[PDB]
Amino acid sequence: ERWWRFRVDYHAGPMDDLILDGVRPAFAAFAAQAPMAYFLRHWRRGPHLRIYVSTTREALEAVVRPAIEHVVGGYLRARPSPGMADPSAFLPLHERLAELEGEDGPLMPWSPDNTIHAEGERPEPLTVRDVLLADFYADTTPSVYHALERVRSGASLPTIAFDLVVATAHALSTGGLPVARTSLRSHAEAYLARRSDGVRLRELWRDHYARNREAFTERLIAVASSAESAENGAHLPHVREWVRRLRPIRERARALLESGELTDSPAFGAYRLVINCTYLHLTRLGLTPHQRFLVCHLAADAAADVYGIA
Amino acid sequence: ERWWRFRVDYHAGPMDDLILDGVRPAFAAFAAQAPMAYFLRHWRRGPHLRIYVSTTREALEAVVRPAIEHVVGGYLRARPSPGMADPSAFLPLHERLAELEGEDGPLMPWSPDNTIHAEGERPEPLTVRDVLLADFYADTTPSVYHALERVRSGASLPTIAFDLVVATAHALSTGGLPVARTSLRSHAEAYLARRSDGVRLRELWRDHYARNREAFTERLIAVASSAESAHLPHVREWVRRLRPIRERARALLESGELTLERDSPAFGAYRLVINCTYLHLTRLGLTPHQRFLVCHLAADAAADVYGIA
C-alpha cells in the first residue's frame, strides 16, 4: 500500500559488505510479506544506503522494521565504519550536486555513522516512469548480489560493466551491436566532450585499447554470442540472465510509449530506457561514471575491429 | 623584491590544520628575511594551498624554500591527506567554478597529493589593485589564524562570517549599516538570481530568519556596537586593520589609480573593502553558498532593526 524508506549510514566501511551481509539477509527475512524491496547508494549527509520497501503500515511495524533493525543492526555492530576524518572536505561538492540533482535537505552536519533511521513513506503516489523504475530495481537485486559477491571475491568490476553494457546493447536494440555500437560511443563522447583534457583522455583510452586489443574483441564476441544465444549453456552465465531479466521491462516500456505514457518509440525509445537502467545498475554496483564511460569507449572501439571490417 | 609562488597539495586532509600547523611555522621561520607573505585556498587540479612570498631570488634559495620544504613537508609526511577516490567526481564542481572563475588552466589531471611544487614568479606587471590586494592578504593573515583557532576550538565559522560582514558594513561604509545593508542584500540577490531553485531558497532563508529573529537581531546590534567603539574581540581588530586599506583605497580612487573595475570615497573604497572581507571569508574556508546565506540573513536582520525607522 506504500513505499517505506530507511537510511543506513556507512560513511567509510566496505559498502558492498553491508549490502551482502546486512541488507541481503534482512531482505530475505521479510520477503514472504514484502518482496518489493530495493536499495540505492547515495552521498547526502555522508555515504549511505537508501532502502525502499513496499508494504502496509501494520507489516512495517511487525516484520519489515524489526528485520532491518536487528539483522542490519548486527552487521553494523560487528563491522562498523571507521568514519570520515573531515566531512566538510566534501561540502562544496555536495552543495553542487544538491543543485544539479534537485536534492533538498541538510548537507551538514552528517548523519551519525553506523546508524539506521526510519524516513517514513514516499511523498504521495508516484509518476509512471517512477513505478517502472522501482520494478526495474527490485527485479535486478539478485543481479546486484551476484555481481557484488563476485567482485569481493576478486572479479573485475569494470569487466562486469563491460559485459552488461555490450549485452544490453546487442540484445535489446533493434539492429543489435553493429547498429548500436554508435550509441555506446556517443555515451562516452558526451563525457570526453565536457572535459577540458578530453584529447589527452582519448589518447590514453586508445593507447590502452591498442595495447590490449585482442582481449577486448574476443571478449566482445563472447558477450555478443552469449547474449543472442537462447540456449541456457553459452560462454557466460549472467549475460543471458541480465538479458532475460531486462526484456519484459523494455516490453512494458515500448507499450508505454505506444499509448502516450511518458517521454520511434517502439524502436529506439524503450531501448534508450533499458540502457539507462543498465547504467543505473552499474552505479548501484559501485562503478564510477568515469569507469563507465571508459567501459563504453573501449566497447565501441572493440566493436569497430569486429563489425567494421565486414 | 619579487613575488615567489608555491603550491601545496592537500586534497582530503584538514586544510585548517595544514594552515595552522604547517604553513604558519614555515612563514614564521623565514619572517626575518621576508615577512611579507600570504596564502590562499584553491581548488584547481585538486584542493591546495597557494603560498605567496615576497623576497629576493637569493633569499628564496637561501632561507624560505628550505623553510617550506622542511617545515611544511614535515607536516605533510606527519599527517598526509588520504587523497580522494575519484577526482573526476569533482568535475561538476570545478567546471561551474571554471565559468565564474575565468581561469582556463587545465582542470585535470590533478597535481599529486601531499606534495610541494615551486611555481616561479608572478607575471611581470602588477596592477595597483594586485598590490593593494596582496597588502590586504598579508596584513590580515593573523586574522585568519585567530579565526581558525576558534574554529578548531569549537566556534561556528558562519557566525564569524556574520560578525565580519556586518562589522565591515557598519564601521567602514559612509552611512553605516542603515545604508549599507542594501549591498549586503545585493550580494545574496546576485546569487539567488543565478540559481534555478532561487525561490525555494528564499523561502528557506526567510523561514530560518523568522525562526530565530530575536537571535539575529540582537547579534547584529552587538556587532554594530563594537564597530563604532566592547563585548566582541575580533570585530574591532577587523575594523582597525581594514580601515587603513579603506583609507589607502579612497586616496587611490581620487588620484585615479583604478578606473577599470564623494562616491569615489563612498561606494568605491567601501566596495573594495567589503569584497576583501568576502575574499577573506573564502580564505577561512567558508563556501560561497554559506557566505550568501549569511549576507541575506544579515540583510533581513538589518530590516527588523534599521527598518522600523
Binding site: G105 | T159, H208
Partner: peptide, 9 residues
C-alpha cells in the same frame, strides 16, 4: 552566542 545556521532545523 553562536547563531543557529541550520536552515532545516
Amino acid at each position: 552566542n553562536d547563531l543557529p545556521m541550520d536552515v532545516f532545523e
